[PDB]
Design a protein around this ligand. Structure first.
Ligand SMILES: [K+]
Ligand SMILES: [Zn+2]
Length: 351
């Protein structure tokens, strides 16, 4: 019940200082690397995009792991959808990237290879930081830093396009009844990002809207003053934290076979945004209703698992839970675990 969930939230707060201290160390190294790249390199136009769980104020664990995005301002990009994937594209131009062009198409593999080598090069001049390599993951994260051989920092390179968003997003970002049609128009005037990502041989890039995800989470109410005063304290962020923690704790129980390896915090975050669409009123997220609101989040996530459908919040035809991405057996296994936990008041949360 809600008392147990409040106790979980209190336990998560115990880690706040370790996470923010580690975030400061990451920022020091990231800033140093950025300055090396901007001064003189093939990536002079690089900039820091402050996106991800820490900047959304929902990173509640893993102080030795951070995800960082670098953006690269590029001239006007023309996109070509890869097959009917909706989220993966070839990048053409209508420039300082000609080196990575093959014909008209900007090569993600060439850009990624240059990026990794250049970062390796600059890191040799930076204190107690080394480049390590994790699983390629289609090209994003591009490269991993290890700081004082403790903190792993995944760095993603993203091209910034200031053009209007691709057609596949036309029916996405269904925030009109929650955050307003005015806000949806405002957000769609912002740039979008392209991250090098294999689509599952090809030089494809995947759309990224991490900056918009941050904006929503940090300005998340129907009321503009949601969470700015004691009368409008909602539980949206608490629910996302509890959903992330639920998944983390379930994965912890299968560290041997890693049966839940295909599931990510991004799945939980995406499902959470859909529940915000379904429950657009701040009165549907009253902090006094934490237990009901968390149940709303858990039951919607269960629905996604059972129906094998979790639409990307910005690209509705990109199904994160399609059997091409996550096998049916894994989704059924997670359904059984979450079903049991929900029916028993989340004993995974017991002390
Ligand atoms: K070094
Ligand atoms: Zn709020």
């Amino acid at each position: 019940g809600a008392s147990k969930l409040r106790a979980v939230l209190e336990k998560l707060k115990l880690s706040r200082d370790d996470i923010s201290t580690a975030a400061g160390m990451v920022k020091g190294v990231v800033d140093h690397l950025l300055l090396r790249l901007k001064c003189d390199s093939a990536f002079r136009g690089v900039g820091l995009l402050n996106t991800g769980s820490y900047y959304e104020h929902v990173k509640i664990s893993a102080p030795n792991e951070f995800d960082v995005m670098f953006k690269l301002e590029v001239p006007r990009i023309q996109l070509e959808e890869y097959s009917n994937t909706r989220a993966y594209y070839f990048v053409k131009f209508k420039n300082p990237l000609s080196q990575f062009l093959e014909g008209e198409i900007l090569s993600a593999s060439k850009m990624l290879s240059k990026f990794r080598k250049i970062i390796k090069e600059e890191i040799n001049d930076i204190k107690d930081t080394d480049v390590i390599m994790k699983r390629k993951r289609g090209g994003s994260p591009a490269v991993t830093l290890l700081i004082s051989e403790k903190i792993s920092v995944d760095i993603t390179l993203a091209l910034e396009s200031k053009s209007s968003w691709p057609a596949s997003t036309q029916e996405g970002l269904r925030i009109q009844n929650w955050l307003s049609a005015k806000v949806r128009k405002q957000l769609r005037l912002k740039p979008f990002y392209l991250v090098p990502k294999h689509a599952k041989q090809e030089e494809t890039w995947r759309l990224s809207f991490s900056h918009i995800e941050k904006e929503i989470l940090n300005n998340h109410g129907k009321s503009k003053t949601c969470c700015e005063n004691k009368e409008e304290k909602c539980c949206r962020k608490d629910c996302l934290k509890l959903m992330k923690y639920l998944l983390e704790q379930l994965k912890e129980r299968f560290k041997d076979k890693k049966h839940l390896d295909k599931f990510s915090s991004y799945h939980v975050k995406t499902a959470f945004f859909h529940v915000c669409t379904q429950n657009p009123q701040d009165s549907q997220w009253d902090r006094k209703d934490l237990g009901l609101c968390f149940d709303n989040c858990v039951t919607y996530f269960l629905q996604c698992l059972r129906t094998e459908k979790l639409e990307n919040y910005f690209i509705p035809e990109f199904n994160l839970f399609s059997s091409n991405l996550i096998d049916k057996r894994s989704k059924e296994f997670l359904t059984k675990q979450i079903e049991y936990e929900r029916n028993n008041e989340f004993p995974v949360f017991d002390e």
